[PDB]
Symmetry: D2
Subunit: 482 residues, 4 copies
């Protein structure tokens, strides 16, 4: 369902509400502190020592209050950065609600980040403290010998019942629109660190709630990367809408086929890989799901979805929705909803297929995807050098090459770094045609860029004799050939 007129107006009239104070406002809207709101997978160990399967609004306020005082006692003050090295969406979200209540910044770090690289990334942030769990803690104590070290490398088990008494007197913190609440990192291709504020992280959400969109009470299962800006924006968003949120730390398509069947969620958030794993695996009940929300680089037919019939009345079409979202850590929210089509920019965002001089390119020509929005990061942490340089012509270059039609429908063709000059070859597009001409094809990778010419070569039941096989798909379709 969609939220009531009552909650919408309460939300849109709360000039204070933002990513940094979401749970402390929910009581004031009238929610009961006994209601169940956030459903856990079992990985998360509570301070009393338990492993809760569900938290209520009040329980989450005391879990968050517990971690909060532990930090304020360990010495965390406002505007202080805390590096959080875990892999549990539940881990990051609770530390962010706590650290935000004390006015601090929860710098989320995926523990699996390549080790020698994680050290430079955390080192560069100058955080006053690290918090982690037992699997990575022994290595993170190296950071205590950093020129400017963290005050502490702690474990979550160090947060014990009653630590909340040390929480500050003016709790919770009163955020200003611009007060940082988070720092996230890029995924691969020295990760770039972007910080997010009380306002930018919820700018897209509320902008959508205001148009009458993305404002359902439907149960959502969040099996996203736990460190990623969206896992936090959707755990924060669902709680705000009153939508039962469910955290799954298992990215396996098979664990999410259990989760879909166990929790029977109406919508399911994950990355493309997760939905793929799900797609390869008849006797599964995916009846509850009406929409899959994906993001990053055929389970649909086992579902259903509501539409408007010619009677101008609801219909229960068969199959669920697959929504390919285009996002980044630095993009804050999603800026588009739908070659490979990304869709039209949403009303609180501006988009351009930019040129090398930065001039908006006309429709149909290929260029750098560029965007603008107050949902966007205000900058790279401690690194003004790289940031101002990732902008061209007034747009934030997202790092992808694309083109657009007259409606401003955009299509991702390739990564800028991945396009090849060959007397040009956008590989993600080139890859996709092959998986579409030759169904048998499970995977493809097409290999002088945006510098000089080169040559391109494929990487894909039976086999061919090779080039001649693939090169027939390209010829029919009209593309340069390997």
């Amino acid at each position: 369902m969609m939220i009531s007129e009552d909650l919408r107006q309460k939300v849109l009239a709360d000039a204070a509400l933002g990513a940094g104070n979401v749970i402390h406002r929910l009581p004031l809207y009238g929610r009961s502190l006994d209601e169940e709101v956030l459903w856990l997978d079992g990985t998360w160990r509570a301070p009393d020592g338990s492993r809760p399967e569900v938290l209520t609004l009040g329980g989450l306020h005391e879990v968050v209050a517990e971690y909060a005082g532990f930090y304020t006692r360990a010495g965390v003050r406002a505007k202080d950065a805390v590096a959080i090295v875990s892999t549990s969406i539940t881990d990051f979200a609770l530390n962010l609600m706590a650290l935000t209540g004390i006015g601090a910044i929860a710098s989320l770090v995926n523990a699996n980040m390549p080790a020698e690289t994680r050290r430079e990334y955390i080192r560069r942030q100058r955080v006053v403290g690290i918090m982690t769990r037992e699997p990575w803690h022994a290595d993170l104590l190296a950071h205590l010998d950093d020129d400017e070290p963290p005050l502490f490398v702690a474990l979550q088990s160090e947060v014990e019942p009653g630590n909340r008494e040390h929480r500050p007197a003016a709790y919770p913190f009163r955020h200003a629109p611009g007060d940082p609440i988070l720092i996230s990192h890029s995924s691969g291709t020295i990760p770039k660190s972007a910080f997010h504020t009380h306002e930018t992280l919820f700018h897209g959400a509320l902008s959508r709630l205001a148009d009458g969109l993305d404002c359902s009470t439907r149960k959502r299962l969040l099996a996203l990367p736990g460190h990623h800006v969206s896992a936090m924006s959707n755990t924060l968003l669902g709680l705000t809408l009153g939508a039962p949120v469910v955290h799954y730390t298992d990215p396996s398509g098979k664990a999410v086929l259990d989760g879909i069947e166990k929790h029977r969620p109406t919508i399911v958030f994950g990355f493309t890989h997760t939905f793929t794993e799900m797609a390869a695996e008849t006797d599964r009940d995916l009846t509850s799901v009406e929409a899959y929300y994906a993001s990053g680089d055929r389970l649909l037919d086992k579902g259903y979805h509501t539409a408007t019939g010619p009677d101008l009345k609801p219909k229960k079409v068969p199959g669920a929705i697959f929504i390919d979202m285009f996002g980044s850590t630095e993009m804050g929210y999603v800026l588009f909803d739908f070659g490979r089509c990304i869709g039209r920019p949403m009303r609180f965002a501006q988009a351009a297929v930019v040129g090398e001089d930065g001039s908006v390119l006309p429709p149909g020509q290929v260029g750098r995807l560029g965007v603008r929005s107050k949902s966007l990061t205000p900058g790279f942490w401690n690194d003004n050098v790289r940031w101002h340089k990732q902008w061209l012509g007034g747009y934030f270059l997202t790092g992808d090459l694309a083109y657009r039609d007259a409606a401003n429908t955009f299509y991702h063709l390739d990564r800028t770094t991945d396009a090849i000059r060959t007397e040009f070859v956008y590989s993600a597009y080139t890859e996709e045609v092959l998986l579409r001409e030759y169904p048998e094809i499970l995977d493809c990778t097409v290999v002088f860029g945006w510098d000089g010419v080169a040559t391109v070569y494929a990487l894909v039941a039976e086999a061919p004799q090779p080039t001649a096989w693939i090169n027939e798909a390209l010829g029919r379709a009209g593309l340069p050939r390997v």
Copy 2:
């Protein structure tokens, strides 16, 4: 083709630019005065006595100067309203350009307005002046017996070579964003008076251009009704773009077929009534291939006959341009209150809200409705009218829940795509639910009218009725059955 970056940046850097100074600014961008800007129907008598078929930047700037001065000598001062009573896109355009230079307001009035209604409509505006032509001038002198009478009921022929000497010394005016430039009117259903400002009438154009949209140089044939804000909006806009504009006073399908063949426009603005007329013609060896887009502005429209005689550029799998058969059809959603289109694309799909616009399906209390639920179409946009000339009573009554009600009932898919069902007034209640006459009508491939009859049965009116289908056509409710959905 798209305008150059050099021009785009100049427009987007011209904080001064708006609906009220378009022609006074193009020179400053580098436009040559010798250059041609405007192609005419041959129906306009110029001050020289001529009926020129094309005006240059410099000559329009000349002809505008004359009307401008003629007005300044008749006593028109800044912020004054002047009714233009005509039936010619071209007349409305030249008086509008002129009044704006002296700081004045051109109240467009369709002369074909019923007389006593048109008399009521102008009387309410309290204008200092009417300018019309001989077809209506004799009747318009009645307004000289209004309690607050216009200073003059003039004729266009009265504007003579050399009248420009009387225009003011600071010509051209220096408009404020909020300065009225124009007043438009609705179509019965007394019309409402929407006033548009130097900002509202250009907020939508410039916003889109900023995104790299609706900003091509292609030759446009504007056979729109001259008195609509849409006719003036696109006229001015093309001038701004460097796009060849072509005014046609004859909206007939045969007339426009000639213009398409004569001028070979890339895009054509007209009303559904015009595009339908064209589609009922041989069109065997009519060359309508120049056109890639037909732009409409309730007539619902065989149009596919016309589209198929065209082409449209697309991006193929070679990732390079590709000529494709058939031209585009854009049914834009428009009203007086909207100085641009707000929507871009089961039901007449109106489109998706445009970045500078906000749209909602609203309940009777003004509560945003969920998708699939049927309500009143509502909007918000800095392109909208700031209000009805001399009528805050009617203006405010049109706002519900914070949205401006367009008078049309609708629903929107979960993608925020809006689909028109009916005008709020035309819908019939039955003991089995609501019947939307516009949806039934367009729902057995001449005319239809799903009227109904019985009592009060309207969106607001509680009380049921029964529906009846009135079919034109000839060898005379089972099609209703063929798709969901009369006695």
Copy 3:
């Protein structure tokens, strides 16, 4: 004393709050219904037949509920304008709360508007209803012969205990920022009808409060004309701040000197004439020590009243220091202004523009003039009226250069301090220069007046002084 951080943050975090729902928000901030909020002066008769001397938040919400219902039963609907014809800040203030609750607009009309003009002023608003009292009701029935006649001409006595049941179910209305709440009218010089919205009428108040200004809890005595927009905003604003508001229907110097003694207010709002009169009394056995600020108006004015007071200052110890005499703020306003745009020698200093306002001295082509040059005062603000009701003709004609001409001529110093000289219409051209009547009157006022004899008309003239009781002109430097 300043409002608490807890209230400030609640107000500043309340995206919904505006002139049209001030009381409906106060509870949600935590105010008690039992608390007293509005102190009246015995002129107003309540629905149950009383003449209460104070109202509580809960009881004001009850009185407003009744008027609202009575109107909702008479047929008044949302975006429907209703003329309120009275002379009482309390009448207007109460009808204004009720109409907003149903989403309607209240057109404040001062009954003492000359009849033949007052009829034209109401006719030009096409209201669905008039509400008034016995003094004027029989005459106001002429509007029943208007071509578009009000649905009803009612008396306030018709509002009976229990009419509140008829109010709408969704009471109270939910205002949009742009939703009209109020119409005010100009003195005359037909008056212009300026309409104010849920947003504009509080746009200034809220701007000021964000800054930590114009936000004290001090008790305030409003002896302003009830029909002026500022009389309603200052009422509305005081309730918002939690400050005891006190309505006085009598603007006479005696009545207000009595009120100051009875209620011992910290600040007093009135028109200049009110304050001049108080200054002419004995002021010997009077007690005006409570007052630290007089808030005032083409009438000039009174150091007697000020010396009977005090004002807190910062001493060289960096600590509070009560000092003799109370403050006088000679504020500049019009119907169109909404809030005050200027925060207060050669001329009547107008003050400095406030953060949410822009002011300019413009020429006849609308150009910005330099400091020291004389021109027409012009302004811009989100507090200003968005237009004249049913008069776009008159409205657009008051703008020059992007600015709203306030109808006055002025100059400003290099500090963008503006000084009023005269109303554009009162200035006299002469073979030797321009003469500003308000400045000249002021200068002359030898402590023992009217300078007469145009700004747009190129004709020269001669000027003459009329006293009631040219060497003084020379002394000060004038012609």
Copy 4:
């Protein structure tokens, strides 16, 4: 004089105008490239080897196009930062006008910054190249051994006639509102490096022009610190209004008295000190040209126009003294008064903030805080000290103050300088320099733990402590 209606409208209708395109737009408004626009003190060497005494618009555009190509050839690309290490307002301004058109950031560094610290400041910034002059260059070549080194530590003589050909084809650069143009630095610890953009650096200026303020054609003499945000805004501002700008690199009260006598300027910009030293000089000096002195940081021989009772102008004696409150991070001045700081200017919002950040009531003492789109968007490469400088939604300026009911602020002290007993040092100091005409005072002492205050300042006293203390007693303050 005020600028014309024509320039005002032209400027206010240039949505492209900002700090990074100031001279490239001035031709478009209709200025002649033959006009003289910028007056120099003689200490500047031109590419040809000349030391010009005045530059024209086109001459500025050629000298600017020169450095641009030398920089564009040396390998500087857009959004790239260049540390400029000098002491000359002319040095910094010419390099900033140039880099801006190449799209690069002119990171202004005062060469006299303590040495080992100016090393750590430049090394943190990670610049692509250094530019300096012979007096300091030999030391700046050390930065070539830093972990992430500069492409070039170059000298200004390396920019030679004809380098302008190497400028890019798309020149000048098209700035976006948020594109960086400058990095300036503070003056109580490792200086903070604040970056400024094409919109923030010029936001106050144009906001004032819009209200009809700070828009004169009057000749102005800029003897400000060459590296300071001020010295750049008034230069760009002077060029924009059409006012003859004049650079004096000598901050001595005597050198400006020579400058005010030689150039007869209408207004004079400097820091508090230059005007003070100037006060101890002379009588037989002609400062009649001057009607206003503009100061920042930390008279009877002139005239000023006022409005007389005839409502006609009146040349009064003595020039105006305007004590402005600004900082590198504040971008523009946010307060004006003619220690009263004045009222915030319309484009600025200010508060005396508590320790919880709550707007304090009038009369109580707190941290000075402000908000404006003129403010810097952050400290270069340092999002850690940046957010920590904000409290309650405000940017703490570093000063303690209080305000009256009009929002007139009075600076009392720097926050670091107030001693608990509480005694605001700058206020106490001035109190004593007013009871006793004397030289200069400095009150020391537990800051914002208790302490005891002591003093530091023609006859001499026996009990200097008995003395000073009667001033305080009468005045009403804690005693030393």
